Design a protein around this nucleic acid. Structure first.
Ligand SMILES: [K+]
Ligand SMILES: [K+]
Ligand SMILES: [K+]
Ligand SMILES: [K+]
Ligand SMILES: [K+]
Ligand SMILES: [K+]
Ligand SMILES: [K+]
Ligand SMILES: [K+]
Ligand SMILES: [K+]
Ligand SMILES: [K+]
Ligand SMILES: [Mg+2]
Ligand SMILES: [Mg+2]
Ligand SMILES: [Mg+2]
Ligand SMILES: [Mg+2]
Ligand SMILES: [Mg+2]
Ligand SMILES: [Mg+2]
Ligand SMILES: [Mg+2]
Ligand SMILES: [Mg+2]
Ligand SMILES: [Mg+2]
Ligand SMILES: [Mg+2]
Ligand SMILES: [Mg+2]
Ligand SMILES: [Mg+2]
Ligand SMILES: [Mg+2]
Ligand SMILES: [Mg+2]
Ligand SMILES: [Mg+2]
Ligand SMILES: [Mg+2]
Ligand SMILES: [Mg+2]
Ligand SMILES: [Mg+2]
Ligand SMILES: [Zn+2]
Lengths: 38, 94, 134, 176, 135
RNA sequence: GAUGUCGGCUCAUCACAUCCUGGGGCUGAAGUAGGUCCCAAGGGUAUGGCUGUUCGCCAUUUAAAGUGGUACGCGAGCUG
RNA sequence: CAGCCAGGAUGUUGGCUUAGAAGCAGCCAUCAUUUAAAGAAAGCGUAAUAGCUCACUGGUCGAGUCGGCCUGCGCGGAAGA
C-alpha cells in the first residue's frame, strides 16, 4: 500500500474509489498500484 | 452574420463598470464617423463565446441597440489580466 | 515443442537440426526423407518452412508451403550480407525482371481478385532491404 | 436507476408477501425475508415486482436499484438456488464434509473445522473440491470467503484454497 | 542562472509588489505559461522550470523566457546581530498576476501543455496555460 | 532590594516522530532472513574500560539497549 | 456510452545482431495485402518460439452519454509533550 497526499491512476487498470471518507486507488493488474490518501 | 444585442449605458465610471462586470455584463464603446460615440453594455457570455471565432475580428459585425442596427468592426479588446474574460471592447463604425 | 529453421539437405546435426523437429516427436529421418524427395526437385538450398501438423510417436504427415522470397533476392546482387539501415546504403538495385521472377513463387497460392495488387507486398521487403525498382 | 427500472418477474410457485417495508419470498428452495430501505416503494402488480423511490429521499433511485438487485437475487435463490465451488491446491491439502462441518487439512499442525450456517450445505466430490449450495447469495458468498481465508492462494505456486473460477496470478522468485 | 551582467548599484530596497502585470499577451510564440498569483521568482526557479520544459519537448520548437531576475536579495549570515545591509545572495524577478512567464512555439498544443505543467511544478506561484489571440 | 551552574546519584512523569514485543499492505517477498510504509504508547527497554564529562570510542551482553518534553525534570533531596 | 458475442491472417522467424530475437532486448525499413479489420505490433510471457490479449471492424441491447471551462460549500494533505 502506498500512502501519499497525491494519489492518482497509474495505469489503465487503476480505479479511484472513496471508502469511509478516504480516497483510494485500487488496481486489478498491479498490487504495487494500490494507494490510499494520507 | 455576427449579431450582438446591446443596451445603452445609463451610468459610467469605475463603480458602474465594476457593477456591470459583477452582473455578468461588460461595457463597450462604438465610435467613428461623424456620429457621437455610443457607450453600450453587452452580455459577457454570449460575446465571449462569439469572439472565440477568428472571424469576429475580421468580419463586419451588426450591433442591435434600441432596435436600430449598427455596422461595426472590432477595433480593440481589453481582456482580464488572467481570467478568460473580457473587460471592454472598442467598436469602430463601418 | 521446440522449433528451428531446419535445413533441407542435412539430417540430424546436433546444434541446428536435432531439436528442430526431431525433439518435437516427429520422425526426423522420415521427414528429411519425404521432404528430402520434395527438395530434390526443389532448387539447391531453399529453406522452406512448412506448417507442422504432426504426432509424437514417429507418425507424421505434412502440408506444403510456398518457397520464400527474401532468400532469392541476393543472387544477382553479388552480396550475401545485409545493411544496418536501408534507404541509406543499398546492396545494389535489382531488375523488375528479377522482382517478378521472385513474385512468380507466390502466385499460385493466392485468392486475390486482381493479382496485380500484390506487386507492392513483394517490394515491401525490397524497400526494407535496399532493392529499389527503377 | 436503470437497474431499478427493470421489474422482476415472479415465477409460478413463488409467493411474495409485502408488509410495509418487510418483504418475504417463498419458493421450492426456502423462504427469505428482507427489510427494505425506507426510501424504496415496491409494488407487486401482476406477477412482477416494480421498484421506485419514495418522495423526500435524495438517494431514492440508488436505494431502489439495490432493492431490485436484492429481490432478483432472492427470486433466483428460492427457485434455483446458488452454488459455489472451491478447489484446494497443494500436496496434502484435503477437505471432507461431515454433517454440516467441513474438515480441512491445509498444512497446519492442527485440523480446521468450519461449521456451516443454517441454510448452507456442502459436498466434497473429490478430496480437493468443495461445493456449497444455498438459497441466500450473500450467505453463500460469506461462507466461501471464510473457507478461502484459511489459506488464501499464494503467488509463487498458487497453493491454497481458491475459487474454482478464480485466476491466481503467479510469479517467479527473484534470481541470484 | 540569469543575473544582470552589471548593475548601477549592488543593493536594492525591499520595496513592495502591488498591481497587475504588464506583458500579459503571448507576444513571441503560440503558447504561454501565465502567472495567476503574486510573488518572487528566483533565478534558480526560473532555470529549474526552463530545464523541465526543454527536456519535455526534447529540445524541439522554440522557448522564450519573458521574465528576468534583475532584483538582488541580501541576507544576513547566521549568528550576526544592524551593522549595515547584508550581502547579496541571489536574484529574483517580481511577478504580478497576468504576467506571461514563458512562451513556446513549434510544437503541438498537447505537448506544450504537458511541458508547461512539468515546469509549473517547479514554481512557487500558481499559473495557467494561455494561447496566442489575434487581438 | 538574587529565578543556584555542567555532570553524576535518588525519584520520576508525559508525548509518539515506535527501539523490542503485538497487528497489517507492498517488495527487485521461494524458505530462513530482510527492505519500506501503515496501525499501535499495554508493558519492557545493558553492565563495564577511558575521561569531570553529557557525548563518544572500545569490551562483553540483550527481545531491545527508542527519540524527545518536563526551569537543557529533580542541589529548602544527596554529591561537588 | 457501458455490458455480452466473433476474428487479429499472407509475404514473415521483415533485415541486423546473437548461442537463438520469431510483433513483443535493442536498432533500420515501418509499406502492402485479401478485405467488415489488423500498429512489421501495447505490455505480459517464452533461453528464445508457442501462448496471452490491446489497438483494430461490427452483432445485439433502446435513451441519453462523454469530458473540458467558470463558479458556491465541503473532503484528504493534518504528529507533542
Ligand atoms: K524522560
Ligand atoms: K513491531
Ligand atoms: K512488513
Ligand atoms: K508502549
Ligand atoms: K568527549
Ligand atoms: K533553570
Ligand atoms: K547544595
Ligand atoms: K526551591
Ligand atoms: K536538605
Ligand atoms: K449534451
Ligand atoms: Mg474500516
Ligand atoms: Mg472606489
Ligand atoms: Mg512605495
Ligand atoms: Mg510595476
Ligand atoms: Mg524579593
Ligand atoms: Mg504513529
Ligand atoms: Mg511486524
Ligand atoms: Mg503507559
Ligand atoms: Mg493510554
Ligand atoms: Mg487491556
Ligand atoms: Mg582499574
Ligand atoms: Mg577513572
Ligand atoms: Mg536541569
Ligand atoms: Mg529528560
Ligand atoms: Mg529544588
Ligand atoms: Mg570542584
Ligand atoms: Mg483544505
Ligand atoms: Mg480531518
Ligand atoms: Zn494500475
Amino acid at each position: 500500500m502506498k500512502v501519499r497526499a497525491s494519489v492518482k491512476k497509474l495505469c489503465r487498470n487503476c480505479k479511484i474509489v472513496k471508502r469511509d471518507g478516504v480516497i483510494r486507488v485500487i488496481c486489478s493488474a498491479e498490487p504495487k498500484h494500490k494507494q490510499r490518501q494520507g | 452574420m455576427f449579431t450582438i444585442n446591446a443596451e445603452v449605458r445609463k451610468e459610467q465610471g469605475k463603480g458602474a463598470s465594476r457593477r456591470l462586470r459583477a452582473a455578468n455584463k461588460f461595457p463597450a464603446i462604438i465610435y467613428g464617423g461623424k456620429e457621437a460615440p455610443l457607450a453600450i453594455e453587452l452580455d459577457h457570455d454570449k460575446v465571449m463565446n462569439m469572439q472565440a471565432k477568428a472571424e469576429f475580428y475580421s468580419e463586419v459585425l451588426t450591433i442591435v441597440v434600441d432596435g436600430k442596427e449598427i455596422k461595426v468592426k472590432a477595433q480593440d479588446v481589453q481582456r482580464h489580466p488572467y481570467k478568460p474574460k473580457l473587460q471592454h471592447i472598442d467598436f469602430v463604425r463601418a | 515443442y521446440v522449433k528451428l529453421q531446419v535445413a533441407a539437405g542435412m539430417a540430424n546435426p546436433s546444434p541446428p537440426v536435432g531439436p528442430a523437429l526431431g525433439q518435437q516427436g516427429v520422425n526426423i529421418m522420415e521427414f528429411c526423407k519425404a521432404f528430402n524427395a520434395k527438395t530434390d526437385s526443389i532448387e539447391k538450398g531453399l529453406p522452406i518452412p512448412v506448417v507442422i501438423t504432426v504426432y509424437a510417436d514417429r507418425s507424421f504427415t505434412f502440408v506444403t508451403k510456398t518457397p520464400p522470397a527474401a532468400v532469392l533476392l541476393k543472387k544477382a546482387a553479388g552480396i550475401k550480407s545485409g545493411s544496418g539501415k536501408p534507404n541509406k546504403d543499398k546492396v545494389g538495385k535489382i531488375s523488375r525482371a528479377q522482382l517478378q521472377e521472385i513474385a512468380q513463387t507466390k502466385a499460385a497460392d493466392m485468392t486475390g481478385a486482381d493479382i496485380e495488387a500484390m506487386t507492392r507486398s513483394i517490394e515491401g521487403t525490397a524497400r526494407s532491404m535496399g532493392l529499389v525498382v527503377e | 436507476s436503470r437497474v431499478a427500472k427493470a421489474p422482476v418477474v415472479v415465477p409460478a410457485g413463488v409467493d411474495v408477501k409485502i408488509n410495509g417495508q418487510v418483504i418475504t419470498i417463498k419458493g421450492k428452495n426456502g423462504e427469505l425475508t428482507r427489510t427494505l430501505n425506507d426510501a424504496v416503494e415496491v409494488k407487486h402488480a401482476d406477477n412482477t415486482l416494480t421498484f421506485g423511490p419514495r418522495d423526500g429521499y435524495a438517494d431514492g433511485w440508488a436505494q431502489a436499484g439495490t432493492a431490485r438487485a436484492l429481490l432478483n437475487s432472492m427470486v433466483i435463490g428460492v427457485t434455483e438456488g446458488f452454488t459455489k465451488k472451491l478447489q484446494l491446491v497443494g500436496v496434502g491439502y484435503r477437505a471432507a464434509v461431515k454433517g454440516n462441518v467441513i474438515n480441512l487439512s491445509l498444512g497446519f499442525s492442527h485440523p480446521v473445522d468450519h461449521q456451516l450456517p443454517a441454510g448452507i450445505t456442502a459436498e466434497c466430490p473429490t478430496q480437493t473440491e468443495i461445493v456449497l449450495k444455498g438459497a441466500d447469495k450473500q450467505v453463500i458468498g460469506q461462507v466461501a470467503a471464510d473457507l478461502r481465508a484459511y489459506r488464501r492462494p499464494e503467488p509463487y505456486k498458487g497453493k491454497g484454497v481458491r475459487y474454482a473460477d478464480e485466476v491466481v496470478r503467479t510469479k517467479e522468485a527473484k534470481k541470484k | 542562472m540569469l543575473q544582470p551582467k552589471r548593475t548601477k548599484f549592488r543593493k536594492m530596497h525591499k520595496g513592495r509588489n502591488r498591481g497587475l502585470a504588464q506583458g500579459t499577451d503571448v507576444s513571441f510564440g503560440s503558447f504561454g505559461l501565465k502567472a495567476v498569483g503574486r510573488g518572487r521568482l528566483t533565478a534558480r526557479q526560473i532555470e529549474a522550470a526552463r530545464r523541465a520544459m526543454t527536456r519535455a519537448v526534447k529540445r524541439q520548437g522554440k522557448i522564450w523566457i519573458r521574465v528576468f531576475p534583475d532584483k538582488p536579495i541580501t541576507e544576513k549570515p547566521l549568528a550576526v546581530r544592524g551593522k549595515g545591509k547584508g550581502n547579496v545572495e541571489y536574484w529574483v524577478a517580481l511577478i504580478q498576476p497576468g504576467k506571461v512567464l514563458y512562451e513556446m512555439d513549434g510544437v503541438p498544443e498537447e505537448l506544450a501543455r504537458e511541458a508547461f505543467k512539468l515546469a509549473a511544478a517547479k514554481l512557487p506561484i500558481k499559473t495557467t496555460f494561455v494561447t496566442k489571440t489575434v487581438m
